Amino acid sequence: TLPKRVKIVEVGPRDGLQNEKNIVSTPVKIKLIDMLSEAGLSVIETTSFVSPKWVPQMGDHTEVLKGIQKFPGINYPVLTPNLKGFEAAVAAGAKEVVIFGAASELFTKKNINCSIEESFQRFDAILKAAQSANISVRGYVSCALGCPYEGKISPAKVAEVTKKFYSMGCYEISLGDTIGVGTPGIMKDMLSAVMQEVPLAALAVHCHDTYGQALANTLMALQMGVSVVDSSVAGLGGCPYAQGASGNLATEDLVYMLEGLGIHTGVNLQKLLEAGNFICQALNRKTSSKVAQATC
Amino acid sequence: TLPKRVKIVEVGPRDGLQNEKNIVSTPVKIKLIDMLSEAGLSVIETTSFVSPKWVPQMGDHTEVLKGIQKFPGINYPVLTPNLKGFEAAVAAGAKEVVIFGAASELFTKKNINCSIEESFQRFDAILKAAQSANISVRGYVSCALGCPYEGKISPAKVAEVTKKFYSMGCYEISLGDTIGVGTPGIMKDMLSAVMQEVPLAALAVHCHDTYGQALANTLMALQMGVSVVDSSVAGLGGCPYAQGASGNLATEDLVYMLEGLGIHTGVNLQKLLEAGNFICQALNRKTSSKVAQATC
Ligand SMILES: O=C(O)CC(O)CC(=O)O
Ligand SMILES: [Mg+2]
Ligand SMILES: [Mg+2]
């Protein structure tokens, strides 16, 4: 059956802005984030404490985390790819961090020269450091429904890596269809294998709409009992590993569906559409949200 | 559970084109339909035999039906609103016609001008003639998941109309979310009420993606056992009852989902994309197919 409430994780300011062609000033980022908080989102991925030399679009991570209004009860997780970034994030006041791995050997190797097993040693250091500081850690498992290099990905394999993340300390793992090649059957098989080893409450789904399958894959996950899904404001984002089509599932199209289902999200659609319109103008782009297009 | 095979009903050349800003030459329509035949679609809504007064985009209906190649096995149904339209269709060689009703009263008044009950008298004569003429007839029930004038529409009222159409001769009734406001739950309640009165094999779904819910509502119908769904080539068309937003579910995105689910469609995706690209160019527009944008 369908959950009664879904926790929506907004990734537009990080996953979205990181993979957008144009860049916006720090004040725009802070304003966009305050607008999503005003819209009622309970968790907003804010920035990434990664080297400016590798991903310059996230270069203002320290000032963004310190400049945003911290609404009551709302979580503002930040990405910390390594120990150095983790220490900076903590020093900047972060209370939740996010680490990312993959269920694909080829993807991991072409992204860090380390095998899936090796990537977990780098994670152990952060998780040990996070535990000593009482900081929460969310995990990202990319290529959960297919890899741009290996093609099909085994469910057992995704279950294996997710389990590792969870036993290592991550209170929540987001299974991501990074290139958007997944379809509901694939989603179903994957989650079925993951749920055997990880409790339902620790799972989240993050689907890309590159092939127009994002919302349908999310619904399958909801029918399977997942109660947390990642999405980006106006469908901002994209994937470096896929032809310049679309990226993240649009938060507005997701809440529209959830409200129709009678599922609580605690999100105000009108105010979410304002945030989307705002960032879209700052970026000189058209929103990828269909609800936004149909509303005005 | 999910059916082993699905009959995709391509409506791009009629539904799609009738609801597009720009128009195209008769030779363009003909070639589009031949390309759609090439791609393997088993049923292609070819044109509409309606007055050029109302919709001039469909004026060339006679020459279009006569000029398109007739591939073995493929069906080329055409719309016939009044008895005179049905007259011309038969003469032009039509072997299948389409009559369109609506579960919404106000809608039947803005569309053609009469009572939902009165509109059944018209359909009777056509169905009667169609029976003498030996022509199979397909029905269209609009506002199946809501109306732009009445708002919510009851599953009972939809079940009522579908039942009337089915007992009156139609071998298949296409239930359509003309404004694309439906969500999975509404689709389920609707299908549920209709399936009580009409066998499943005679049901078809037609969902617009105006709010980005088309593929999800379609997945729900498939999960309910519906095995024929309507879609338009490159997401061609649009709803006259809303802003400048998308219209019909894009056929390429739907076969990608079906192929992903291992469901037989018999459609060649690459040739389908060729067809989509061909028409978008003639229309001087950008495809609304995500799959198209990701493939190239
Ligand atoms: O975590 C990501 O989604 C991307 C990385 O942080 C940036 C990189 O590609 O190096
Ligand atoms: Mg993403
Ligand atoms: Mg339509």
Would you call B294 helix, strand, or coil by DSSP? helix
CB atoms within 10 A of CB A116: 18
How far CA B293 is from CA of A243, B76, B237, B271, in Å, comes to 8, 28, 18, 15
Residue A250's SS3 state is strand
DSSP letters along A22-33, please?
S---HHHHHHHH
Q: Do B216 and A213 touch (CB under 8 A)?
A: no
Tokens for A45, please give them: 């991925």
**Tokens 């088993």, located at residue:** B42
Nearest alpha-carbon partner for A198 in A278, A114, A249, A141: A141
E runs forming strands in A73-171: 78-79, 96-102, 136-142
Give the pair of three-digit tokens for residue B295: 């493939």
- The count of other CB atoms within 10 Å of the CB of residue B52 is 11
Q: Cβ neighbours of residue B115 under 8 Å, at least 6 residues apart?
A: B105, B108, B109
| Contact residues for A7 (Cβ-Cβ < 8 A; gap 6+) | A42, A43, A204, A227, A228
Contacts of B85 (CB under 8 A, 6+ apart): B48, B49, B50, B79
Radius of gyration of chain A (CA): 17
Q: Most B CBs within 10 Å: which of A183, A187, A222, A277, as the mutation test of the B interface? A: A183
CA dihedral over A140, A146, A148, A152, signed as positive or negative: positive
Cβ-contact A120, A101 below 8 angstroms: yes
| Neighbouring C-beta atoms of residue B4, cutoff 10 Å | 9
Distance of alpha carbon A169 from its chain centroid, rounded?
18
- DSSP sequence for A69-94: ---TT-B--EE--SHHHHHHHHHTT-
- Coil vs helix vs strand at A249: coil
Instruction: Round to whole Å and give the CA distance between A165 and A161.
Output: 6
Give all domains of chain A, ordered by start, each with its CATH number.
Answer: 1-296 (3.20.20.70)
Q: Is A238 left (phi over 0), alpha (psi -120 to 50) or beta?
A: left
* Contact of A165 with A225, CB cutoff 8 Å: no
Q: Locate tokens 């001769």: which residue?
A: B169
Other Cβ atoms less than 10 A from the Cβ of A201: the count is 13
Judging by beta carbons within 10 Å of its beta carbon (0-12, 13-18, 19+), is residue B242 exposed, middle or buried? Answer: buried
Whether B239 is catalytic is yes
Neighbour tally for A178: CB within 10 Å? 28
Chain A residues close to B291, C-beta within 8 Å: 211-212
Task: Test A183 with B289 for CB contact under 8 angstroms.
Answer: no
Amino acid at A254: L
Q: Measured in whole angstroms, how far is the alpha carbon of residue B66 from the centre of its chain?
A: 21
How many Cβ atoms sit within 10 Å of the Cβ of residue A140? 25
- The answer to whether residues B194 and B159 touch, using CB atoms and an 8 Å cutoff, is yes
Closest to B127 (Cα-Cα) out of B101, B98, B103: B98
Ligand 1 lined by A55 (C-beta under 6 Å): yes
- As beta bridge partners, residue A138 has A98, A172
Question: Does residue B245 contact residue B209 with C-beta atoms inside 8 Å?
Answer: no
- Structural resolution in Å: 2.1
- C-alpha of A82 from chain center: 18
Cα separation, B272 vs A264, in Å, equals 39
Tokens standing for residue A229: 């899904």
List, in sequence order, every residue forming a beta bridge with A101; answer none if it has no partner. A141
Distances, alpha carbon B15 to alpha carbons A9, A160, B11, B139, B294, in Å: 38, 48, 5, 14, 25
Query: What one-character-per-residue DSSP string does B80-144 give?
Result: --SHHHHHHHHHTT-SEEEEEEES-HHHHHHHTSS-TTTHHHHHHHHHHHHHHTT-EEEEEEESB
Tokens of B261: 């689910």
Which residues does chain A have within 8 Å of residue B296's beta carbon, measured at their own beta carbons? Answer: 243
Residues, Cβ < 5 Å to ion ligand 3: B 15, 248
Residue with tokens 């599953």: B155
